[PDB]
Tab-separated table of C-alpha atoms (C1' of nucleotides) in Angstrom:
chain	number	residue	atom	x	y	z
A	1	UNK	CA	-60.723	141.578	-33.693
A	2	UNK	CA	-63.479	139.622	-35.113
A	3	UNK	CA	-66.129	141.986	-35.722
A	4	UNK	CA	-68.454	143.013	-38.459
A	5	UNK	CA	-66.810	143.774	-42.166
A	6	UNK	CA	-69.988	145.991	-43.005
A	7	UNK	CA	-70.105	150.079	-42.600
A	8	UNK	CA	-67.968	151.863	-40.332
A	9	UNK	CA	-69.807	153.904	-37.368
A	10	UNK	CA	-72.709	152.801	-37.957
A	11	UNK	CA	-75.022	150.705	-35.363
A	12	UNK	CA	-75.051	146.651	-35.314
A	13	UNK	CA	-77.918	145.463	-33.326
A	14	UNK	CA	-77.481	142.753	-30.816
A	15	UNK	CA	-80.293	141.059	-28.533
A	16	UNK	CA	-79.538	140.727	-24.921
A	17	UNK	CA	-81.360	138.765	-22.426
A	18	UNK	CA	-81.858	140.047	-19.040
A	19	UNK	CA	-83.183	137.193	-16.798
A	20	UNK	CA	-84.151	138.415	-13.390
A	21	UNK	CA	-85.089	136.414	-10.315
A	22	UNK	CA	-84.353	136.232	-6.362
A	23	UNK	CA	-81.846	134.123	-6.865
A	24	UNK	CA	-79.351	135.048	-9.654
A	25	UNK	CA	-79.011	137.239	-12.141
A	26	UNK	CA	-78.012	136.554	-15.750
A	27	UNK	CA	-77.030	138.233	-18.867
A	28	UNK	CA	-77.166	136.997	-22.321
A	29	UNK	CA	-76.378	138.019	-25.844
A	30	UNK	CA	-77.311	136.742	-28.990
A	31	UNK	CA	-77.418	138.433	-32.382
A	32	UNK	CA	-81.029	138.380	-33.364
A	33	UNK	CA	-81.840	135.147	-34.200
A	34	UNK	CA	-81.101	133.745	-30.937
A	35	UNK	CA	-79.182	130.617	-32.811
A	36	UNK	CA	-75.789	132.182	-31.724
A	37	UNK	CA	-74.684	133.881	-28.770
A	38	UNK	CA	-71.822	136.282	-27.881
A	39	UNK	CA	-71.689	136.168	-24.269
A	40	UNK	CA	-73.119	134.230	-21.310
A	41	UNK	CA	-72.358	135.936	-17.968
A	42	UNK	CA	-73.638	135.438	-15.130
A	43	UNK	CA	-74.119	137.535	-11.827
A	44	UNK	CA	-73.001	134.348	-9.838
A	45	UNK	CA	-69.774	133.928	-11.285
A	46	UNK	CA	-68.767	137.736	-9.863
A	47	UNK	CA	-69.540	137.200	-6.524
A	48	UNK	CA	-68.181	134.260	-4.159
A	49	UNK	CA	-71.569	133.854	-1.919
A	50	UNK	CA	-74.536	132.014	-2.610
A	51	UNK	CA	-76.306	134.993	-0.916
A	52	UNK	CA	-75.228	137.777	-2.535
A	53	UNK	CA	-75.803	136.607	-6.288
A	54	UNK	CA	-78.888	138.403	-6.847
A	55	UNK	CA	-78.054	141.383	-5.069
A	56	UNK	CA	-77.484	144.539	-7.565
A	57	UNK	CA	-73.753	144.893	-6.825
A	58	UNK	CA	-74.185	141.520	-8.864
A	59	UNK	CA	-76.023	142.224	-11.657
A	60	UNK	CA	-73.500	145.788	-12.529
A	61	UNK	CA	-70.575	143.666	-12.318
A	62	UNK	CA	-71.664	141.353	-15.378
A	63	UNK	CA	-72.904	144.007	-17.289
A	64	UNK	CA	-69.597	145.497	-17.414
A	65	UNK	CA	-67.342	142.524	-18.797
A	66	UNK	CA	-70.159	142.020	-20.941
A	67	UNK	CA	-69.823	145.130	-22.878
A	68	UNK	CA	-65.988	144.460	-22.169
A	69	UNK	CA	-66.771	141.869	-25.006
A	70	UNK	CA	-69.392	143.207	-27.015
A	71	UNK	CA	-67.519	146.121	-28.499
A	72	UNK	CA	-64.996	143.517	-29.706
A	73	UNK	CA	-67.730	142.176	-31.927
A	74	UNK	CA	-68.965	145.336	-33.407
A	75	UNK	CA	-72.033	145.565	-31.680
A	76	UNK	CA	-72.362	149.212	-30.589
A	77	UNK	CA	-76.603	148.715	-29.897
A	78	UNK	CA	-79.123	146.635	-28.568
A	79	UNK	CA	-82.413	145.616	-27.857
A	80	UNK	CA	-83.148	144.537	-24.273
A	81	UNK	CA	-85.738	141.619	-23.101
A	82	UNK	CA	-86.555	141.501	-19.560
A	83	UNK	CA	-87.989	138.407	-18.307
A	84	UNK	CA	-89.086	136.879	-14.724
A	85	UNK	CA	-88.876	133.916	-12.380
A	86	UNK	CA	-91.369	132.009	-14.635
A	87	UNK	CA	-94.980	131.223	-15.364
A	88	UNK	CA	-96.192	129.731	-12.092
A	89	UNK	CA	-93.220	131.783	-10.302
A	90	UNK	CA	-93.664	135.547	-9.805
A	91	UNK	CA	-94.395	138.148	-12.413
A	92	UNK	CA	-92.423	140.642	-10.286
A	93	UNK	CA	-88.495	140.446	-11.346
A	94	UNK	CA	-85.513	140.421	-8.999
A	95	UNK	CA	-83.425	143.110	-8.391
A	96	UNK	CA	-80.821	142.702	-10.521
A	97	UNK	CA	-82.638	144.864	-12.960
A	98	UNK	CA	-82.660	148.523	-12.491
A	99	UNK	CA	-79.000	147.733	-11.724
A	100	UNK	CA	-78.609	145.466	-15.200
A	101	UNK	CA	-79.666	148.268	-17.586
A	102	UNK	CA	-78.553	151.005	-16.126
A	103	UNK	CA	-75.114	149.792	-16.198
A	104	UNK	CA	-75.175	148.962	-19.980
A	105	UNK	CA	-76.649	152.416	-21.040
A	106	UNK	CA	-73.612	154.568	-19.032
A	107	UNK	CA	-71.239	151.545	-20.916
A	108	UNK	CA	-70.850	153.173	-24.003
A	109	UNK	CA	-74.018	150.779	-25.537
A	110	UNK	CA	-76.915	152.160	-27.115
A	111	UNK	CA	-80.407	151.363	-26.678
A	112	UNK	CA	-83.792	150.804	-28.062
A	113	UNK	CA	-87.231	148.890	-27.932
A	114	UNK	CA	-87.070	147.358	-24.256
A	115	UNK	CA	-89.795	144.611	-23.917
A	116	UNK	CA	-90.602	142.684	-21.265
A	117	UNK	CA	-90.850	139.042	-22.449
A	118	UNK	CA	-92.013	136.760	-19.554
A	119	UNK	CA	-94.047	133.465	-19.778
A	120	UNK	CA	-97.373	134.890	-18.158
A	121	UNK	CA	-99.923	131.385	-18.565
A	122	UNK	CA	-103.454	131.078	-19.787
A	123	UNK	CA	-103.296	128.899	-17.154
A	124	UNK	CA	-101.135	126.142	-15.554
A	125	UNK	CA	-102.004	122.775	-13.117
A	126	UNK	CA	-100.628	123.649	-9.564
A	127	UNK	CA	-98.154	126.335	-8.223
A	128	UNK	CA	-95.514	124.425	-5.740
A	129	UNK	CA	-96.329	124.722	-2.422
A	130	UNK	CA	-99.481	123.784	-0.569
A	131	UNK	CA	-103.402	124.576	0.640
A	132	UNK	CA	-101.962	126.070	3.248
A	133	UNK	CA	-98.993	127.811	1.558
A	134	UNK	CA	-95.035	128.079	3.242
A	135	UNK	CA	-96.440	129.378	6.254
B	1	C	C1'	-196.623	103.208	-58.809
B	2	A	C1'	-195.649	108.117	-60.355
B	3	A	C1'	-198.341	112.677	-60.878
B	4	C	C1'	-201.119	115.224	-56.944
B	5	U	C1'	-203.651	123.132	-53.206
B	6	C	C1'	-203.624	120.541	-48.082
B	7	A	C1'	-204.510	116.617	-44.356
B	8	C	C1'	-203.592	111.924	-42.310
B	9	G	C1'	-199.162	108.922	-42.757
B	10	G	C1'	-194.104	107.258	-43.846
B	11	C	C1'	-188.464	108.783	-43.032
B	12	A	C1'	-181.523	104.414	-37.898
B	13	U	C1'	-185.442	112.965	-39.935
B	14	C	C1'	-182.250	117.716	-38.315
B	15	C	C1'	-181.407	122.361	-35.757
B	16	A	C1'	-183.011	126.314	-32.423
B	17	G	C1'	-185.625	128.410	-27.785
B	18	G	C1'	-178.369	129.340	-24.582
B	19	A	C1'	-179.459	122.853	-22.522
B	20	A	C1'	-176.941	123.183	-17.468
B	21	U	C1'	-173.177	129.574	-11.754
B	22	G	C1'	-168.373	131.806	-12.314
B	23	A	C1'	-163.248	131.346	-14.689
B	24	A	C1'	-159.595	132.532	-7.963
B	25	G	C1'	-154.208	138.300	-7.555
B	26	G	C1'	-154.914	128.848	-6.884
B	27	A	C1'	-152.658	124.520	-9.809
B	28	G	C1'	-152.112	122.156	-14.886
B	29	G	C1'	-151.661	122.427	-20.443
B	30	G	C1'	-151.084	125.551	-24.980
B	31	U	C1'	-149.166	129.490	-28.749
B	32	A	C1'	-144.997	133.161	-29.676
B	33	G	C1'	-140.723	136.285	-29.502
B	34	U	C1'	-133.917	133.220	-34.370
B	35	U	C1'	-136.943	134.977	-26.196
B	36	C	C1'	-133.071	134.412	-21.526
B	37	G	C1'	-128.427	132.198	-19.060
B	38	G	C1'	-120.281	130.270	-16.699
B	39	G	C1'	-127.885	124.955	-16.552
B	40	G	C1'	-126.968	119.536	-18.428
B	41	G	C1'	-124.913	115.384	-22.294
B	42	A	C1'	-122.168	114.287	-27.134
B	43	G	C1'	-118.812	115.393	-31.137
B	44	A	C1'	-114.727	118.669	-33.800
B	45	A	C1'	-111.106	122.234	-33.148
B	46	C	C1'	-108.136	126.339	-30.277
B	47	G	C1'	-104.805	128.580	-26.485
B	48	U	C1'	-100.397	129.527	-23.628
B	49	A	C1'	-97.756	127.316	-19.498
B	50	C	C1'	-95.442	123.273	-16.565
B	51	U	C1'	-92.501	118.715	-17.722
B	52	G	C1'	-89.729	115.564	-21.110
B	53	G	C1'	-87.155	114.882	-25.863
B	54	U	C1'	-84.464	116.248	-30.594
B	55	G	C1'	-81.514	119.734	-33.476
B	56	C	C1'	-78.470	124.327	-33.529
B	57	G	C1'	-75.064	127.844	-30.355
B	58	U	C1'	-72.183	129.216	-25.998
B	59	C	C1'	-68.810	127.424	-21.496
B	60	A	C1'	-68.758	126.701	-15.787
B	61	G	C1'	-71.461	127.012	-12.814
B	62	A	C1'	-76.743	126.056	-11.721
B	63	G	C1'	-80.709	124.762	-7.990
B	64	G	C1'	-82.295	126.544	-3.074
B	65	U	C1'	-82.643	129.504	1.795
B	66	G	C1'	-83.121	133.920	6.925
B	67	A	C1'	-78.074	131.795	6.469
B	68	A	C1'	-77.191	126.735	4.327
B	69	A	C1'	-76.942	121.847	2.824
RNA sequence: CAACUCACGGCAUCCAGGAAUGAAGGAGGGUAGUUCGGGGGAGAACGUACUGGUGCGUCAGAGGUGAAA
């Protein structure tokens, strides 16, 4: 394996990145500097439906096979980011968290210093969408 | 021319006999508190976000919807 040549049993941080929306699901993993990644795994890619790619069956089934990697590298903790549709999209996040974390936790991972990390504006020029709104 | 009790007289002589009703629970104008405030104009900086671009990583899906395209 490729992992870390320092300590033995002892924990190597990583950074994951836990993007939530309506729509998909992703998860992420990066070291700490976020210049080089580990994973890239994607709720989507689990699933063959465009409907059922957010949905928290999803999410679980990404967080697996990403651990399933992880280990491999020597990283036996984290440090989880959640984040949100965007800045004129919804503050709320999908559903695929509460299924995301709680997958990685019972995984074998450890945990610690969960942030939420979401663009919120000071303000923006128009949300999408109308006077009137979807109606 | 001056001197010179007091008078006459001379002096682009002066002030006082309140000589001009009151100061509207009307208006106007002052003086002051470094008063009071998303009031107005000009100039110099600040903040994230949307969008685009560049560099560095990863690798096959991503967008979108009730379901899709």
């Amino acid at each position: 394996f490729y992992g870390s040549s320092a300590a033995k049993d002892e924990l190597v941080y990583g950074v994951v990145h836990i993007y939530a929306s309506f729509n998909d699901t992703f998860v992420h993993v990066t070291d700490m500097s976020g210049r080089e990644t580990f994973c890239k795994i994607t709720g989507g890619m689990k699933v063959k439906a465009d409907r059922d790619e957010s949905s928290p069956y999803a999410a679980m089934m990404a967080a697996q096979d990403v651990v399933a990697r992880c280990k491999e590298c020597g990283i036996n903790a984290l440090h989880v980011k959640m984040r949100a549709t965007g800045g004129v999209g919804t503050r709320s996040p999908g559903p695929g968290a509460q299924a995301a974390l709680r997958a990685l936790a019972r995984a074998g991972m450890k945990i610690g210093r969960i942030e939420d990390v979401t663009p919120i504006p000071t303000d923006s020029t128009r949300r999408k969408g109308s006077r009137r709104g979807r109606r």
